[PDB]
Amino acid sequence: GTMYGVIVRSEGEDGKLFIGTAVDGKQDYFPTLSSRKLPRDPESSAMLDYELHSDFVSSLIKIPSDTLALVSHFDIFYIYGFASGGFVYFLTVQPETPDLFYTSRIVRLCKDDPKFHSYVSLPFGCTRAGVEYRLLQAAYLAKPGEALAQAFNISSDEDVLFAIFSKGQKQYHHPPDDSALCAFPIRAINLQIKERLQSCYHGEGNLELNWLLGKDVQCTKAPVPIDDNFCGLDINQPLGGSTPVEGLTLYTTSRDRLTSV
Amino acid sequence: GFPEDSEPISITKQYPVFVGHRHRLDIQMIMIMNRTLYVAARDHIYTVDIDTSHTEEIYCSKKLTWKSRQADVDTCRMKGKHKDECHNFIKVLLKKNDDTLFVCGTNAFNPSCRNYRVDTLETFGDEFSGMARCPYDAKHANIALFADGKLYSATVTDFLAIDAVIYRSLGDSPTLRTVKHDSKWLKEPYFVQAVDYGDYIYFFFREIAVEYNTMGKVVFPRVAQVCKNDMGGSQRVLEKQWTSFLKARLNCSVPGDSHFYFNILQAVTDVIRINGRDVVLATFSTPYNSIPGSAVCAYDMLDIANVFTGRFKEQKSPDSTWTPVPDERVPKPRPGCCAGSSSLEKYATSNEFPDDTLNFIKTHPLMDEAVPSIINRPWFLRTMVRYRLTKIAVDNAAGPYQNHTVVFLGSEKGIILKFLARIGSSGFLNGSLFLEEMNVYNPEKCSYDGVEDKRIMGMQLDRASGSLYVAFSTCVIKVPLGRCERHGKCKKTCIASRDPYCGWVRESGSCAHLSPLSRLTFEQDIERGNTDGLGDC
Amino acid sequence: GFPEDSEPISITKQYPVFVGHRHRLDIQMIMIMNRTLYVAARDHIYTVDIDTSHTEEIYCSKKLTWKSRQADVDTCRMKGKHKDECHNFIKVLLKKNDDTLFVCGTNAFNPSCRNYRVDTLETFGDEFSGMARCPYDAKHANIALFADGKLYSATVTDFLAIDAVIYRSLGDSPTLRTVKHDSKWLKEPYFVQAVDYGDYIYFFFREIAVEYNTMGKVVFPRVAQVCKNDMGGSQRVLEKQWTSFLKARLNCSVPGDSHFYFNILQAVTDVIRINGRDVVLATFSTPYNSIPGSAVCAYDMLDIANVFTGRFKEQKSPDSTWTPVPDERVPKPRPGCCAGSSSLEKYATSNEFPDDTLNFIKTHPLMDEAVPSIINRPWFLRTMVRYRLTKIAVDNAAGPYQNHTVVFLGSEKGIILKFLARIGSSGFLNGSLFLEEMNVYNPEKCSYDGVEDKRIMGMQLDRASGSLYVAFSTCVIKVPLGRCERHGKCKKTCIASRDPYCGWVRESGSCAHLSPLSRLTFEQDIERGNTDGLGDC
Numbered sequence A: 001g002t003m004y005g006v007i008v009r010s011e012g013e014d015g016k017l018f019i020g021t022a023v024d025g026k027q028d029y030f031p032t033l034s035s036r037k038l039p040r041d042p043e044s045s046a047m048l049d050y051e052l053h054s055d056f057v058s059s060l061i062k063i064p065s066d067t068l069a070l071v072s073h074f075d076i077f078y079i080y081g082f083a084s085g086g087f088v089y090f091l092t093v094q095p096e097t098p099d100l101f102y103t104s105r106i107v108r109l110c111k112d113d114p115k116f117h118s119y120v121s122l123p124f125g126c127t128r129a130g131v132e133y134r135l136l137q138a139a140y141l142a143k144p145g146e147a148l149a150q151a152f153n154i155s156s157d158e159d160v161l162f163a164i165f166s167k168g169q170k171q172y173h174h175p176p177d178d179s180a181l182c183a184f185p186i187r188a189i190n191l192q193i194k195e196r197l198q199s200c201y202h203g204e205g206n207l208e209l210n211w212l213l214g215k216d217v218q219c220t221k222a223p224v225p226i227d228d229n230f231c232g233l234d235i236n237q238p239l240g241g242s243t244p245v246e247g248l249t250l251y252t253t254s255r256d257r258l259t260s261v
Numbered sequence B, C: 001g002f003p004e005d006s007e008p009i010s011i012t013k014q015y016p017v018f019v020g021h022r023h024r025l026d027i028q029m030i031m032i033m034n035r036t037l038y039v040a041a042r043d044h045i046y047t048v049d050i051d052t053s054h055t056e057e058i059y060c061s062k063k064l065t066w067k068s069r070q071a072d073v074d075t076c077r078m079k080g081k082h083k084d085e086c087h088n089f090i091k092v093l094l095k096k097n098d099d100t101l102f103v104c105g106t107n108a109f110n111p112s113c114r115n116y117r118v119d120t121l122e123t124f125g126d127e128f129s130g131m132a133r134c135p136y137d138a139k140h141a142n143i144a145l146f147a148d149g150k151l152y153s154a155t156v157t158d159f160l161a162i163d164a165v166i167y168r169s170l171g172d173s174p175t176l177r178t179v180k181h182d183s184k185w186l187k188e189p190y191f192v193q194a195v196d197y198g199d200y201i202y203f204f205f206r207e208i209a210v211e212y213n214t215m216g217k218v219v220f221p222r223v224a225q226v227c228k229n230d231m232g233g234s235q236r237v238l239e240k241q242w243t244s245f246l247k248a249r250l251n252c253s254v255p256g257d258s259h260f261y262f263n264i265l266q267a268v269t270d271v272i273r274i275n276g277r278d279v280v281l282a283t284f285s286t287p288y289n290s291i292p293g294s295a296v297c298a299y300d301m302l303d304i305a306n307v308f309t310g311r312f313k314e315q316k317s318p319d320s321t322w323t324p325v326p327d328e329r330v331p332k333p334r335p336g337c338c339a340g341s342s343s344l345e346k347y348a349t350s351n352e353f354p355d356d357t358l359n360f361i362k363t364h365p366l367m368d369e370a371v372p373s374i375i376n377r378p379w380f381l382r383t384m385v386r387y388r389l390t391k392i393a394v395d396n397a398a399g400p401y402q403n404h405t406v407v408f409l410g411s412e413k414g415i416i417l418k419f420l421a422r423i424g425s426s427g428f429l430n431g432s433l434f435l436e437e438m439n440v441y442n443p444e445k446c447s448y449d450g451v452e453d454k455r456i457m458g459m460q461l462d463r464a465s466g467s468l469y470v471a472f473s474t475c476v477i478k479v480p481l482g483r484c485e486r487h488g489k490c491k492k493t494c495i496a497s498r499d500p501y502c503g504w505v506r507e508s509g510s511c512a513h514l515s516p517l518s519r520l521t522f523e524q525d526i527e528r529g530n531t532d533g534l535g536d537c
């Protein structure tokens, strides 16, 4: 439960494996998240080579040494990932840069982006009755209810991610019992991102992704339209945010802990 | 109690000037190869044939043109950069051999590198990447050095300029970088200069100091070494990354009960010989937000080497202070000792280094000592000026017998400062001597577009032509080393100027400079500067 | 980028001068009680009756004489001190009540304290010790303060001046010292001033900083509190030693990406009211070995208090950096909270404090925060002067309506600087306004022995007399607050001077100062300083 993968073979190309995993402090040995080649010819030696590998630009993201020093046993656990429309999504739990503060996230990449410039990461969770739940324990993509479709103003085509969460942001390794099922329509994620990108491209705010950037980087104001599916440039990336994507709670309990969905 | 700003011995500008011949030139650097002055600028490289009788205006001998593709400008502008920022500015210009120039440019924030014919300046071959070879921004400072046919470079890899690196590429040798996002290695550095000397290359930069960040952010000047024979680590540690990177703080200060440091390194020279020592000269200054001062400190290349043989630093608890390392825990072979030396000839290539050595030099790039200056203080100070001191040019054989060394200092308001490196009674090196101060900038020839940028950006002394070339972003100026007829027929102060370029010749009865026709009686006092009993003006 | 040294609004000395009436006076400090100016000096205290029509020379009203016994001089000289060092210099002069003056002196490096008659200045009673009440050396700075009939003092206990202390003696209350040879408490301090305000006394000194000694030796300005009701610790901890001593770094800097601090505190005023705030004003300067600058920073007495309610500092491993203290480990009752307050009225005397509290405040005298200045920067800067700024005198009710505040600054070369505390549009405090610069030292009246010591050593403003008294070691000078007839009949710049002491009166047709006969038309613009459309000179 620290690794997840999505195989994306959109038509025309050999297709690829998008994979994220825990790397237990070996920031040199294994990338935290990468896209590998999963080629047609089964015989091929191309198997699990990085989709791109120059000296600098590569289809991989490595946890910097700076962050692994500044936070003790720093890692990123990947719980779920999915193919949706033009994008790949990964759901990640990690300790947080300065008790034990953990933060569940949504990671989004374009299916066709080797430079990994499309990267954008926002925290997610859901809250009901004053209590808040921010420790992702499971997730699962599916079609929306009829009820749920009217709720989110999505078609009965579009995807909804159903997730489970624990109370607060304390001890992921030794979790409590207060757990909560909630639904996130992809359209909401795709739009909450679209507006995050939007503002940041008008000089507004910061990149706000300190585990990978290791410092503060100011959003660059640029005349670039953030069309409905925009796939990053070499500016304003990787993109973060500290403005949770709130999901609609569906059910809670504190007698029993919830594990799967 | 802090030494007063001293006065020049002697007390304007109508020298030759080069303007291209009208647009801005945006000169980025000057250089001299063989007998031609190169002027690397925007969209161009201009040359001047130095020897072609330097006339009223200096005229463009041969030319070069490399503009940015219209496509490349579009993407640039689109990323939210300015109109004048998106051009091809030449930031790298290196002589590979007798036939090849190696030129890179910003190329509107899309750096790329070409090879050019030394003769006609026509391009040839495919263009390769300018990543980590040349800056994206025209304004950033960069290190470009050819040594052993390999390109040692230091700048940024990305448009955003987050990721700074010291990089070695080309020359059939595998490619080496400094560890990415590791501030133990590089923390937001500003690269000033690098030089070739021994089995090592020495980069001079400045960074946010990790030792003294105990309180706020502090900047330190640094000197770092790399082994020319570096081949990268094993398979477990530092593969494709330097195995000989050690850095050390430089010490440029006026000592007191508490010493006042100069940290903002502006310029380092190439290695020079002064008093039978291999030395470099660096200018520094106070942080931008502080009372303005500048110093010039000199460094013996042996002492630089000596610091890398000393003790390393380490930070025990992630919150504890920086303690020296007891030699008991330094492993063998010595971290940062070249592959193939005393005892280390048992190691054929750097790939064979054990895990002990490698995992150590990855974690301890910083040396405990701080390279000390010659005479343990600045050779020159300015504390009561509005400008900082920047560019630095040296003359290690000025005077008839060629045993005096004259140092030229460039500023930001065009003011150019000239001092003589003093020899003590002991014979040892001992302070300096503020000879002359002169303003070189020409408002009527260099303030022509919306531009008046009195900042000196490149200096090149040419003893062969008997001149020093000073480059502003708008123009290049040919200043003669010694304007001796300035002091006049008044013999009293022609001698007192103590200018190694000047003296008295009795056959003419006035003050004039040294000539290759060395048969005539040339009378000068430099070491004593004797005024005693001479007719006044 | 660092704010330029600003110019005074207006552009010498023939004021009244006091010389004693010839020997050196070696004036150590001036003071004003009731309506008489006291001049504490060598072997003497001189007084001047302020109101006795201040004439050509200022004449010695009443006198005092206390020379050192010939025996005491012998031992002094014998310990290897100089002839002029071994005299009785008056360093403490305090008004105990309406009948008693309390005077101590060096007494040739054998300090001792006497009581004197307020009226005739004839001594009475037995002399007691001057140890830790008065300095041995005439040159050292010392804190002497009477509050609640107890003597709060800070100086050195020994001839060698190793052991510095903040001491409370006298007034039927047991005697309290700061822990001897403990640099956590005091590390080589220089005592500048102390003041009475609330349940606390606030000492302003500077010390060798234990936080930032991570590299070399650094000096920090400090403010420290003691509870007026301190009675010393239990039987296990801090018996006969302060139980309310906490200190904190002051913050006087110009902020940048890296901020430039002023650390060398020279003077702090008594508590004053400016814009309905209780404040103190401090002058600072750069370390002796550095480029010379001076600042004036102001401190809200509430913010000072606020810092002592914050978090403490601590050094986990004897080699680790200084981390804040999590409130989890701060014990109750609160360390350095007075005995007899909110929740701490359950403690009758400080002797009852538990071991937890006591053993803590003994180990953690230093607060994490650093008291911030008003407008978080200096109110005044000098960075392009040869002298430092020292003495400081304030006028919190200058002008007709008495809502303007004028600050006088003394230097070291006699130059006296005058600025007005500016009110913003918001109503809040906002910068300053450099009104006038004038040189007060009189070479023809104060350079009379082998002495020309242009250093201002004491300032006393006397609004009642409408004058400011400036004391050099040789003489005291009566400078009038506003010399308004200086600006002349030229109305244009009489208004532009924006001097709250000056204005225009139409009945006379010239520029003159405020008078108690406030019936006449007095026209002044201070807040706007309106020049618009007025006849020139």
Ligand SMILES: *[C@@H]1O[C@H](CO)[C@@H](O[C@@H]2O[C@H](CO)[C@@H](O[C@@H]3O[C@H](CO[C@H]4O[C@H](CO[C@H]5O[C@H](CO)[C@@H](O)[C@H](O)[C@@H]5O)[C@@H](O)[C@H](O[C@H]5O[C@H](CO)[C@@H](O)[C@H](O)[C@@H]5O)[C@@H]4O)[C@@H](O)[C@H](O[C@H]4O[C@H](CO)[C@@H](O)[C@H](O)[C@@H]4O)[C@@H]3O)[C@H](O)[C@H]2NC(C)=O)[C@H](O)[C@H]1NC(C)=O
Residues within 6 Å of the ligand: A150, A151, A152, A153
């Ligand atoms: C899924 O999407 C739907 C559709 O986009 C969305 O429903 C809309 O929500 C928006 C935003 O909340 C509503 O916009 C507000 O409208 C306020 C005025 O609304 C009144 O007027 C509407 C127009 O009336 C004209 O047309 C009708 C024809 O139908 C005609 O009879 C009238 O005479 C008139 O000409 C009208 O449709 C509407 O009536 C419907 O909606 C109400 C509920 O509000 C319902 O009870 C009725 O049965 C009827 O179906 C209503 O009477 C307006 O004041 C308000 O403006 C403020 O806020 C905005 C934004 O902050 C500011 O710009 C502005 O300055 C004011 O401060 C606001 O614009 C819109 O009315 C809804 N549309 C409909 C059709 O209901 C859902 O929210 C989405 N669902 C979910 C779950 O998210």
Ligand SMILES: *[C@@H]1O[C@H](CO)[C@@H](O[C@@H]2O[C@H](CO)[C@@H](O)[C@H](O)[C@H]2NC(C)=O)[C@H](O)[C@H]1NC(C)=O
Residues within 6 Å of the ligand: B422, B423, B424, B425, B430, B431
């Ligand atoms: C070496 O340098 C020092 C300082 O620059 C010189 O010492 C000076 O000597 C002259 C006497 O001729 C004095 O007037 C100066 O005041 C001295 N300086 C100091 C700081 O005390 C020394 O003479 C130099 N030696 C030579 C040969 O130039």
Ligand SMILES: *[C@@H]1O[C@H](CO)[C@@H](O[C@@H]2O[C@H](CO)[C@@H](O)[C@H](O)[C@H]2NC(C)=O)[C@H](O)[C@H]1NC(C)=O
Residues within 6 Å of the ligand: C422, C423, C424, C425, C430, C431
């Ligand atoms: C409060 O202080 C600031 C700075 O001293 C003042 O801002 C200045 O405003 C004037 C306009 O009248 C400008 O000419 C200055 O250049 C401003 N200073 C800066 C640093 O930008 C402000 O006006 C002050 N308010 C009052 C009432 O005096």
Ligand SMILES: *[C@@H]1O[C@H](CO)[C@@H](O)[C@H](O)[C@H]1NC(C)=O
Residues within 6 Å of the ligand: B251, B253, B255, B259, B369, B370, B372, B376, B377
């Ligand atoms: C720098 O040099 C001076 C004198 O040479 C010395 O006293 C000081 O300690 C040095 N500082 C460092 C950090 O090396």
Ligand SMILES: *[C@@H]1O[C@H](CO)[C@@H](O)[C@H](O)[C@H]1NC(C)=O
Residues within 6 Å of the ligand: B401, B403, B404, B423, B527
């Ligand atoms: C240089 O050499 C000549 C003799 O060869 C001597 O007269 C002169 O003083 C020398 N100058 C210096 C600085 O040593």
Ligand SMILES: *[C@@H]1O[C@H](CO)[C@@H](O)[C@H](O)[C@H]1NC(C)=O
Residues within 6 Å of the ligand: C251, C253, C255, C259, C369, C370, C372, C376, C377
């Ligand atoms: C001093 O004050 C400035 C601005 O008020 C602040 O930025 C800085 O961090 C402060 N430093 C300390 C040590 O309090």
Ligand SMILES: *[C@@H]1O[C@H](CO)[C@@H](O)[C@H](O)[C@H]1NC(C)=O
Residues within 6 Å of the ligand: C401, C403, C404, C423, C527
């Ligand atoms: C002082 O008060 C008077 C009115 O009572 C007003 O005219 C003047 O502007 C005031 N000055 C300041 C600095 O507020």
